[PDB]
Design a protein around this ligand. Structure first.
Ligand SMILES: *[C@@H]1O[C@H](CO)[C@@H](O[C@@H]2O[C@H](CO)[C@@H](O)[C@H](O)[C@H]2NC(C)=O)[C@H](O)[C@H]1NC(C)=O
Ligand SMILES: *[C@@H]1O[C@H](CO)[C@@H](O[C@@H]2O[C@H](CO)[C@@H](O)[C@H](O)[C@H]2NC(C)=O)[C@H](O)[C@H]1NC(C)=O
Ligand SMILES: *[C@@H]1O[C@H](CO)[C@@H](O[C@@H]2O[C@H](CO)[C@@H](O)[C@H](O)[C@H]2NC(C)=O)[C@H](O)[C@H]1NC(C)=O
Ligand SMILES: *[C@@H]1O[C@H](CO)[C@@H](O[C@@H]2O[C@H](CO)[C@@H](O)[C@H](O)[C@H]2NC(C)=O)[C@H](O)[C@H]1NC(C)=O
Ligand SMILES: *[C@@H]1O[C@H](CO)[C@@H](O)[C@H](O)[C@H]1NC(C)=O
Ligand SMILES: *[C@@H]1O[C@H](CO)[C@@H](O)[C@H](O)[C@H]1NC(C)=O
Ligand SMILES: *[C@@H]1O[C@H](CO)[C@@H](O)[C@H](O)[C@H]1NC(C)=O
Ligand SMILES: *[C@@H]1O[C@H](CO)[C@@H](O)[C@H](O)[C@H]1NC(C)=O
Lengths: 208, 728, 728, 208
């Protein structure tokens, strides 16, 4: 009973490509509670509405959170082919989803800011022919194949990473490039929610 | 019994070549400076109106080094307090004068010590670099927008080149590229953090008590290279409320796996940009084509639009990959590419097709693509008469590649065989520049009928002057070495009698893709040597030389100091057995690479040469910069090409110098070919007991081209040459 | 028709001068090296015993650069892996070999890169400097005691000199002074924190890709000077339990009010030390006499024991104040002082009385005090025949100043007129060294009877060799300029006919207190020039020269570049009108100050001189170091002597060089007279259109004295001189 | 009642040439109290004994304290002509005096150590003749005339100080030179006591 949003408030929200995932089965949620802590700048959903997503009961609720600048709102879209959907963070298209942009006030102090905002602007493989470049696109509910070579925070805008592949891994190379956006006065975050409606298992309901 | 062309004549510039420099401001108008007045000439009529009185700034309070007029005539940029750095770099102050207000702009000025300034291609936007950061002015009298905050002296370069990119890649100090209508500003960022410094002394005026040590990040062969990143900023989305968003375009994955360079930036359309990247091992390069995304505001570079270019016999391009010339719709482009026979021709590309289509062929080469229309491609080449040292303007019909017209071959075929061209804004008109064999000639033409409008400068005054002086003659011809033509030129003394025997000076450069034999008319030191001192000054283009296909150009691949050295010797052999050459009076001299080859020849032990002069020579390849050296030599490692690096030093041959008289000259402030190189030559000669002549030039760079120094070095070389030749 | 002394003879050292170097180890014994064996010779008998077989270290594993035997014969210090720095400085490795154990000491060794090592004067204590800190070993195989912890490269110097103290004050790298029986170790600390760096390139081997920039704290005229502090440590109170207590002795208050130097350190007794301090304006100096306090363990310097020395016509001393020579009880001392006539004589001091008493007088000078006993003072002077370029040994009786005996004037008056002396530990015996006019002669003597024991080296083998070669002759004489004798020497070609007319080379130094005219026998370049090339090589000591009183020496005070320059010209005038000199073939050449004067003469416009060679010349005084320059010139400020600084540059006279042929030579690694100086000369000549000959020597210091470089420069100067003189 | 040794325990004992002076009139003293805080290394008195100086009553007690190294004990003497008596600290010869060398333990923490121990090793005047040097000796119960030009702690061993004098001050110069001794593990201090026996005013007595 009562859904545990704890570890979100304590520490530093990771970068979009290292998004942390909170899973919710069998509990009650006050979400308008959670969204009353932050200052909320944008709320769009797919196959659901923000009104609806507070009200309904579900069999499964997934909350993904990360640091993310408001300046890059046009790239955090369900209908977007920017670097974010390509190489960083992709939601499922088969479940209803919501995307929240917020700003931690000052009043909230247990949430620490990192050096800067970072994201992956290139993730590709160079085949063993030394010619063919194949972008490695991120699949929903997964991390980029480049998170193994891209630091948790990018040191400088435009840095690039490489790693030669074993003949078993396919040969050729793995290659990535990181981008940065300057840290803001108040930290800015991104939230991605995904709901599953069950048959009989709708044990994730709001509370009253 | 007329006078001769004297050394004094060459140094005082008594016999001047006139020019005609213009700036096309539209498709039918251009600016000219006449009696310090700036005029605008209409191409059609030839009528002119005054654009700027010479008096306008005769109350400025400064000397005005250079000026730049905005593309819309509204503003003029005034450059004063100029201080030189490298071949293309400097700092200065700038003022902006309003041409409508007829006033100076006094507020929000471009700071002192500004490193570079450029107008947008249309309108009057400004981009400038100050303290290694980029700034943009939309309106000239309003505050600037700071684009970059990472600039740092000798470390981070935003919008300007570092030493090696300036000298060996862009041939320019600037690393800014405006989109055609100035909406976007593309720029490079260089990182010299881990690049070793070359350090040297600068002495300056007497009054400076302690010398200054100059420190320049400079990668010698195999050293750590600078790093590069590329960005595009929308100059129309700028605001004083937020910091600018520079969108990065990353290099292709084939480059990111190792060391690489950015080698070309060319805009295709208002929203399409092409980039060429080059691997450190320079026989692999990729073009990237990038489109602006009007929704996201980013730049997408489709992998399917990549164009790989790679060499199996040497490096890519002459010095670097060629620049593409895009059709108006940017969906196809023309580019100079070496063909299956090794000759450089125009190839036609589709931005998403791998294979290209040659539109020119032959055993001659396209020198450059000069203009493109919907109907015609304009280019310079050496096809005429199979003379590789000749240049003519051609136009080829796009609908029919067999319809090529030569626009210059026929205008003045006796006087003019070396042409360059300047086109108006839609190639409606063009200015032609004849550089020889006769006196330079400047003419105006319309492209529509290829009708000759008029003569701009014919150099009649000089022709008039040169009738009262015994001028030398120039022979341009070739010899045949195992079934191959090799061109040479000879500057012949007046009243040349081929039964007599003349002393010969070999003027040599001989670097890869060099050309010392051409149809250009020149008034230089060799003129005086022939006119006054009766010396035959000869040059020879052997293996490694350019514009005659890759079999010749790639000959010296991974073996500089071999063939191009030998052929200079063999050329001297050939010359002597023509019968008018005193074989006991053959000298040789060269600057930079020419200085290297000169030295290598003097230490060959061939006994063909009696004396020689090396000016700022390379002495060993590991002392020279990475980009140039590794292009031809690879890396100086045992796994690669260390052997040929060590086999090709001047010092190695110190012993042989006992047979020759040697003059070694070098400037102390040479940041290009470091004084070091000569210091190592002289030290090896000392260590082996060889006497020689030396001369340093304190505070002179690679050019040794200050007024006094220039006169001094030529005077000194004159004495040395006359003395070796037992001349009065 | 015998052979000549050839250039080859001079450079290959075909005709060797033998020597006899010994080291007195007691009052009647000394060490000599004979066939690589070290022997001890008894002074009386002349019998010898072997001290060290040459074979002893023929299994060492290193080449042995130098050795030092402990004062008690128990230990030998072995110097290997030596690497040079300045004129007196270097680093090396050291081993210590036990002479009784006949073994190498393997534990607690002196570290590599040790900067200096010295035995105590008795016993076998060691003081060494490593990383600018002082260390002491009481027993050689036991751990060392660290005396100082403040050492820091180029900043803090403990027990070693910085650049300027090494060159211009102590003429040594070491700044350590053991008390007589090695109880105390006195030392200086120098602070170069705020002293500007001279920086220059070093190129090293071919294989070094980037040149190194050498940085040396070096105060040019008027710059910030190094700071100095003085300490004494008791080496008998050392312990591994506590850090050593260095007792400071502060300078006198008359020095502390402004910039000053430590100029002399001389122990008087086992518990009394004398210090001389010198003001930056060097016409004021103070001796401090300090006694050890056996209760407190400190050093008290009684104000009543201070001895002020100060000049009103120039600077104090010849180059620095003279060192005192104390009586055994340390209550009185002898010191060389300029008298009321300006001549340098021996004065007798009481440590608490201001006034001193002259014990010598005359129009000649004491060169140095060599030994002191209870009965006799021994000194070298030029009294004999009023020849200032002669040297003899004298002894004066302490009870009767009229009882002076000349110990050398009479031994071999024809062959020997230039003597130096080496005394045994109580002046019971002395070795005499004759340096000319004849072949050098080394003899042994006892002081008791002034009896000559024996001849050590007579150079008979060389005399034998030199009979088969046409050797030149040397004239030493004077001329009279407004009532003053001025000495010169001439090296005359063999078969000299004074009716013929010879070309003349002026060999010049001419710095303050210089002496180029003497009785020394030499085998050098001038020998070859006269023997083989029939050139008269002449030198002349004019105003500013030394050992003839202050009227001549102080003449150039605050006006270097004036009188001493003129007199060199006037000397050439005088020489030509003797009638055997070709007045169309007079050249001039000089190194360092000689290079300065040579240049100043060539730009005089006197037309007396046809050509000239400047090697590493000074060109302007503000480029040279503070200690030397300010001694003669003062500060380069308007309040002081800026005018004469600016009036006395070579560059100023660039124009006049059009009348002369000029050779300018300089080493790139000259830390003494910086390459800068020549760089400024050549630049001014270029800026004014004068041609000249130049030659740099890469990586050579002020001496240009590496084997190869030395041959190279002399060979090159030979050609230049022969060419100016129209010689075959 | 009860003598106030307070400001000694709180702070950094100054250097010998800046010795701080505590005056005592009309109070009771437990001195064996004070000397039980410190570890005491030497106790010598002149014209009195350490036994006697605890017991007697006085009309005036002066306590002078400063930082001072045990290594320099031979220089802190009533019978000494070192730099300490010459230029730093001199007691009266007309009153009975005591000299105490001590070491603050660890147990005592309100007493802070300075960078190093410093003392004056030269204090002299250079007369207006530029030749005559006259040492400026410190008089009892006074500071050195050089404390105006010598820093409260000497920066480096052997530093020297100068100050030109006004024609009214005598002309010429004032000159000084400072010495240093390395700071110790436990701070080491110096105490100088001077007692005056009054006629009837003996109001400074011990307590019981
Ligand atoms: C060149 O001359 C032509 C006319 O011969 C100029 O063009 C005209 O200028 C007149 C003013 O006299 C205008 O009223 C017309 O409308 C213009 N006609 C055109 C061609 O548009 C032209 O200004 C002159 N150009 C220069 C550079 O002086
Ligand atoms: C220069 O080119 C840019 C890029 O195409 C033009 O900007 C576009 O103009 C259209 C029509 O106004 C707009 O709908 C687009 O949104 C614009 N794109 C951007 C990125 O601004 C611009 O019009 C041209 N500028 C000039 C001076 O003609
Ligand atoms: C020089 O010879 C003398 C004797 O002629 C040596 O002195 C004596 O040496 C003998 C051994 O033969 C001793 O027994 C005597 O006691 C010595 N007498 C003296 C002078 O003290 C002396 O050792 C020899 N010196 C050298 C350096 O070989
Ligand atoms: C070297 O000289 C020192 C200084 O005089 C001598 O040391 C003194 O010796 C006497 C007699 O033993 C002692 O009473 C003093 O206390 C010593 N003074 C010091 C500072 O040590 C010493 O004896 C001499 N050394 C040798 C090797 O003879
Ligand atoms: C400016 O133009 C006038 C036009 O007559 C000309 O005479 C004058 O020489 C020019 N002034 C300069 C500085 O060239
Ligand atoms: C440039 O420097 C000059 C000279 O100091 C100064 O007068 C002027 O204000 C500067 N200009 C700007 C734009 O700051
Ligand atoms: C050492 O001494 C012997 C004595 O006969 C001599 O012959 C030999 O040449 C010497 N060895 C060296 C290295 O000088
Ligand atoms: C000096 O250097 C050599 C060479 O590296 C080394 O073998 C030796 O141990 C060093 N000697 C000392 C005293 O450390």
């Amino acid at each position: 009973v009562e859904c545990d949003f704890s570890p979100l408030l304590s520490g530093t929200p990771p970068q979009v490509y290292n998004f942390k995932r909170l899973v919710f089965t069998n509990c009650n949620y006050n979400l308008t509670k959670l969204l009353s802590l932050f200052s909320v700048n944008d709320f769009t959903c797919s196959q659901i509405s923000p009104a609806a997503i507070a009200s309904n009961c579900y069999s499964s609720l997934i909350l993904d959170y990360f640091s993310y600048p408001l300046s890059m709102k046009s790239d955090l879209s369900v209908s977007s082919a920017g670097p974010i959907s390509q190489f960083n963070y992709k939601q499922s298209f088969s479940n209803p989803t919501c995307l929240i942009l917020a700003t931690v006030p000052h009043n909230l102090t247990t949430i620490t800011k990192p050096l800067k905002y970072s994201y992956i602007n290139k993730c590709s493989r160079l085949l063993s022919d030394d010619r063919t470049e194949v972008p490695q696109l991120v699949n929903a509910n997964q991390y980029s194949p480049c998170v193994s070579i891209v630091p948790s925070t990018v040191w400088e805008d435009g840095d690039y990473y490489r790693k030669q592949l074993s003949p078993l891994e396919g040969g050729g190379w793995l290659v990535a490039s990181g981008s940065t956006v300057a840290m803001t006065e108040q930290l800015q975050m991104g939230f991605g929610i995904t709901v599953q409606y069950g048959t009989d298992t709708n044990s994730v309901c709001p509370k009253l | 019994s007329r006078k001769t062309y004297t050394l004094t004549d060459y140094l005082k510039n008594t016999y001047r070549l006139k020019l005609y420099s213009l700036r096309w401001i539209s498709d039918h108008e251009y600016l000219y400076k006449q009696e310090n007045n700036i005029l605008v000439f209409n191409a059609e009529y030839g009528n002119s109106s005054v654009f700027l009185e010479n008096s306008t700034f005769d109350e400025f309070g400064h000397s005005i080094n250079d000026y730049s007029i905005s593309p819309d005539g509204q503003f003029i940029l005034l450059e004063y307090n100029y201080v030189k750095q490298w071949r293309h770099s400097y700092t200065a102050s700038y003022d902006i004068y309003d041409l409508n207000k007829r006033q100076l702009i006094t507020e929000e000025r471009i700071p002192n010590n500004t490193q570079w300034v450029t107008w947008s291609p249309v309108g009057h936007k400004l981009a400038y670099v100050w303290n290694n950061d980029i700034y943009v002015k939309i309106e000239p009298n309003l505050p600037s927008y700071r684009i970059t905050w990472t600039g740092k002296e000798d470390i981070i370069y935003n919008g300007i080149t570092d030493w090696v990119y300036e000298e060996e890649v862009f041939s320019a100090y600037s690393a800014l590229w405006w989109s055609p209508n100035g909406t976007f500003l593309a720029y490079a960022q260089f990182n010299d953090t881990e690049v070793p410094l070359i350090e040297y002394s600068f002495y300056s005026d007497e009054s400076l008590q302690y010398p200054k040590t100059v420190r320049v990040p400079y990668p010698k062969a195999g050293a750590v290279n600078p790093t590069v990143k590329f960005f595009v900023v929308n100059t129309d989305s700028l605001s004083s409320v937020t910091n600018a968003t520079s969108i990065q375009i990353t290099a292709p994955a084939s480059m990111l796996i190792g060391d690489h360079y950015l080698c070309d930036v060319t805009w295709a359309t208002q929203e399409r940009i092409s980039l060429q990247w080059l691997r450190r091992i320079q026989n692999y390069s990729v073009m990237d084509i990038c489109d602006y995304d009007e929704s996201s505001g980013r730049w997408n570079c489709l992998v399917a639009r990549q164009h790989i270019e790679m060499s199996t016999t040497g490096w890519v391009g002459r010095f670097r990959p060629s620049e593409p010339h895009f059709t108006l719709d940017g969906n196809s482009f023309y580019k100079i590419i070496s063909n299956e026979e090794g000759y450089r021709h125009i190839c036609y590309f589709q931005i998403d097709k791998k294979d290209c289509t040659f539109i020119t062929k032959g055993t001659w080469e396209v020198i450059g693509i000069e203009a493109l229309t919907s109907d015609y491609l304009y280019y310079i080449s050496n096809e005429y008469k199979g003379m590789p040292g000749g240049r003519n303007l051609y136009k080829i019909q796009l609908s029919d590649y067999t319809k090529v017209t030569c626009l210059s071959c026929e205008l003045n075929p006796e006087r003019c065989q070396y042409y360059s061209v300047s086109f108006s804004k839609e190639a409606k008109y063009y200015q032609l520049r004849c550089s020889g064999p006769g006196l330079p000639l400047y003419t105006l033409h319309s492209s529509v009928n290829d009708k000759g409008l008029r003569v701009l400068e014919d150099n009649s005054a000089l022709d008039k002057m040169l009738q009262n002086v015994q001028m030398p003659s120039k022979k341009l011809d070739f010899i045949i070495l195992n079934e191959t033509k090799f061109w040479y030129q000879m500057i012949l003394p007046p009243h040349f009698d081929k039964s007599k025997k003349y002393p010969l000076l070999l003027d040599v450069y001989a670097g890869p893709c060099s050309q010392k034999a051409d149809t250009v008319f020149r008034l230089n030191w060799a003129t005086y040597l022939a006119s006054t001192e009766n010396i035959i000054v000869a040059s020879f283009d052997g293996r490694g030389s350019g514009y005659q296909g890759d079999k010749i150009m790639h000959a010296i691949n991974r073996r500089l100091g071999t063939f191009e050295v030998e052929d200079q010797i063999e050329a001297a052999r050939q010359f002597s057995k023509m019968g008018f050459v005193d074989n006991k009076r053959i000298a040789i001299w060269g600057w930079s690479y020419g200085g290297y080859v000169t030295s290598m020849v003097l230490g060959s032990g061939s006994g063909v040469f009696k004396c020689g002069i090396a000016v700022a020579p390379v002495s060993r390849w590991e002392y020279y910069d990475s980009v140039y050296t590794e292009r031809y030599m690879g890396l100086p490692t045992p796994e690669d090409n260390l052997d040929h690096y060590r086999n090709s030093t001047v010092m190695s041959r110190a012993e042989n110098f006992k047979q020759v008289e040697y003059l070694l000259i070098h400037g102390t402030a040479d940041d290009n070919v470091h004084f070091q190189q000569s210091a190592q030559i002289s030290k090896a000669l000392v260590d082996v007991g060889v006497d020689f002549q030396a001369m340093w030039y304190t505070d002179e760079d690679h050019g040794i081209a200050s007024s006094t120094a220039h006169q001094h070095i030529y005077t000194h070389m004159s004495h040395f040459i006359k003395q070796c030749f037992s001349l009065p």
